[PDB]
Design a protein around this ligand. Structure first.
Ligand SMILES: Cc1cc2c(cc1C)N(C[C@H](O)[C@H](O)[C@H](O)COP(=O)(O)OP(=O)(O)OC[C@H]1O[C@@H](n3cnc4c(N)ncnc43)[C@H](O)[C@@H]1O)c1[nH]c(=O)[nH]c(=O)c1N2
Length: 309
């Protein structure tokens, strides 16, 4: 069955929380756990970070937390570090189903010299390494939450939601899908179609795959799930298999869903977008449609949701 979540008063707010904590006075949260999400063949580490905010920093699905890593701002002596934003990967109830924790999905940013591969700790991403190096009990300076672009439209509980992720961009969708399928939320009973597309480098780089695969068996008429593994698969045009190529395998179904009012979401590194736009333009052309006109209508209709970084 669906998992009991508490406290249900988290459903009462009519607007998303925004900027509850600000950079000059962050909330000092506590790490619950840090675990690698990836196997040995993954090109880099991505970790799942669980943070106890005590119920003091609630959020809605699709929002981001800010994290201020320790140390001086290298560009502003005497000043704290700049906030880094992370898409929240949990529902508002969090992974403990209690409204006290939130989770992040963090790629460790590691520098390698382009010719020798030599590392340099001074050039590593400050906050991603800080988070992935964290341990239970460590303290985190948390700000926010913030963001509205990726809030889940719940007005139609039978809407269609097409979720396009690369890498850590799966984060908001983990939250959406737990709310849609896993958690007992009496005021949001999802009966539409949720369709997750995930592009990663290889099978060892998959994120939360067992969770998503479980939804196929639990909600076979409401959930679809397709994966692209760039270093292990090739598209029909012999390039590395990217998320836009998987979309094209379902070009007719996807365009029909869009025409029927589906929401479509994009999240992950901003470099995922040019190839997606190229594929959608070519799909439209083969159908005798103008992708420019289709995208203009999707934006006008508030069906098009992008948060890339
Ligand atoms: C709305 C939104 C949502 C998200 C994200 C952004 C935004 C705007 N991000 C990105 C996140 O905010 C952040 O930018 C990255 O984690 C990198 O931050 P660091 O502090 O690790 O790198 P930092 O900001 O310190 O450095 C940036 C980059 O520069 C490189 N670098 C530094 N000095 C260098 C030098 N001298 N030469 C060469 N390279 C050098 C670092 O290695 C790093 O790759 C994200 N990220 C994520 O992992 N998961 C998520 O869910 C999200 N979500």
């Amino acid at each position: 069955s669906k998992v009991s979540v508490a406290p249900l008063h988290l459903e009462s707010a009519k607007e998303p929380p925004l900027n509850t904590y600000k950079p000059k006075e962050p909330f000092t949260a506590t790490i619950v756990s840090v675990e690698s999400l990836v196997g040995p063949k993954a090109p880099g580490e991505t970790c799942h970070i669980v943070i106890d905010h005590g119920g003091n920093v609630p959020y809605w699905e699709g929002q981001s937390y800010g994290v201020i890593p320790p140390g001086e701002n290298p560009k502003k002596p005497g000043a704290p570090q700049n906030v880094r934003l992370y898409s929240i990967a949990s529902t508002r109830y969090g992974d403990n189903f209690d409204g006290r924790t939130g989770s992040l999905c963090v790629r460790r940013a590691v520098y390698y010299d382009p010719e020798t591969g030599k590392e340099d700790p001074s050039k590593n991403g400050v906050c991603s390494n800080f988070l992935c190096n964290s341990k239970p009990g460590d303290k985190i300076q948390l700000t926010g939450p913030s963001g509205k672009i990726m809030l889940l439209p719940e007005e139609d509980p039978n809407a269609t939601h097409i979720m396009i992720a690369t890498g850590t961009g799966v984060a908001p969708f983990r939250g959406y899908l737990r709310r849609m399928f896993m958690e007992d939320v009496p005021n949001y009973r999802f009966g539409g179609l949720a369709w997750l597309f995930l592009g990663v480098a290889n099978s060892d780089s998959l994120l939360y795959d067992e969770e998503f695969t479980s939804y196929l068996k639990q909600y076979p008429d409401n959930f679809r799930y397709d994966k692209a593994l760039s270093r292990e698969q090739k598209n029909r045009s012999g390039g590395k298999m990217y998320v836009q190529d998987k979309i094209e395998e379902y070009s007719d179904e996807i365009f029909k869903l869009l025409d029927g009012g589906a929401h479509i979401y994009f999240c992950g590194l901003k470099g995922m977008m040019p190839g997606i736009q190229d594929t959608l333009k070519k799909v439209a052309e083969r159908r005798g449609e103008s992708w420019d006109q289709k995208l203009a209508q999707l934006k006008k209709n508030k069906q098009w949701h992008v948060e890339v970084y």
